[PDB]
Amino acid sequence: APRSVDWREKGYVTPVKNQGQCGSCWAFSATGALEGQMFRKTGRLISLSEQNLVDCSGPQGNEGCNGGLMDYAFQYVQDNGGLDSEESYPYEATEESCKYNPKYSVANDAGFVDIPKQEKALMKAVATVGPISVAIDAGHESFLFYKEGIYFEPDCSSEDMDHGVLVVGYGFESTESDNNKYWLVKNSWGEEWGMGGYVKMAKDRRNHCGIASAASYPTV
Ligand SMILES: *[C@@H](O)[C@H](C[C@@H]1CCNC1=O)NC(=O)[C@H](CC(C)C)NC(=O)OCc1ccccc1
Ligand code: NA
């Protein structure tokens, strides 16, 4: 596998979004992964509607601003036969009744793939598929104030994840401790957070923060 991967430079990744004060991280992770796979297939990068997922994917098991799962989101798009664009169905940061309109659908999928729970298996997926939806333990003050460098939190759990994000690559940089590898992760907390909305998460460090514990992507 490659030593460094960045799908943003290949055109797979839309700009950083902001979920506001709604527990909809799962919807942004899922649209991010489906935005990448749709571009892989059509060569067109179109931002997808998280509000569509928040409002409409309850029958698949999601609960709006109170949480959800990326796999449930991919199942909705398959069961529903489409997903509306961000411009047609914009984000309001609040759960409402479903307003899906197939005329404005711009995405489809035919299921999803669950990656084995090993950082080695994740590395392979990122290297060959595109951006990957993942879950992490983001519940630590150090994650809120992250600015730069490789993030490592000694009391992060790898069993208890609470936040869905998007791995868009991986790489390295020399560090004091010689733990130099990282996952490149796109968040949904706006541009102001982290490094332009991104974070470098420690890689090959005992599945840090559970990044490899619930990874998946849609099949288009
Ligand atoms: C991210 O914004 C969100 C925060 C949650 C929801 C409101 N309070 C929170 O702490 N995280 C999730 O939605 C999270 C993402 C996973 C990929 C880790 N999932 C979640 O909280 O799921 C709860 C749930 C489990 C099973 C079925 C339905 C809901
Ligand atoms: Na924790």
Residue numbers in the entry: 1 to 220
Could you pull the original sentences from the published paper?
Several drug screening campaigns identified Calpeptin as a drug candidate against SARS-CoV-2. Here, we have further investigated a potential dual-targeting effect of Calpeptin and, indeed, show the pico-molar inhibition of cathepsins by Calpeptin, its sulfonated prodrug analog S-Calpeptin, and the chemically similar prodrug GC-376. Binding of the activated compounds to Mpro, CatL, CatK, and CatV was characterized by X-ray crystallography and their antiviral activity against SARS-CoV-2 was confirmed in cellular infection assays. All three compounds bind in a highly similar manner to the catalytic site of each protease.
Calpeptin and GC-376 differ in the replacement of norleucine in Calpeptin with a 2-oxopyrrolidine side chain in GC-376. The catalytic dyad of the active site are Cys25 in the L-domain and His163 in the R-domain. Both Calpeptin and the GC-376 aldehyde bind covalently via the aldehyde group to Cys25, forming a thiohemiacetal, exhibiting the same binding mode. The three amino acid analogs of these peptidomimetic inhibitors occupy the substrate sites S1 to S3. The main interactions of Calpeptin and the GC-376 aldehyde are mediated by the peptide backbone forming hydrogen bonds to the CatL main chain residues Gly68 and Asp162 in a substrate-like manner. In addition, the thiohemiacetal oxygen forms a hydrogen bond to Gln19. In the Calpeptin structure the norleucine side chain forms hydrophobic contacts to Gly23 and Asn66. The analog 2-oxopyrrolidine group of GC-376 shows also hydrophobic interactions with these residues. The central leucine side chains of both compounds are covered in the hydrophobic S2-pocket formed by Leu69, Met70 and Ala135. In both structures the terminal Cbz-group is located at the S3 position. For GC-376, slightly weaker inhibition was found (91 pM and 259 pM).
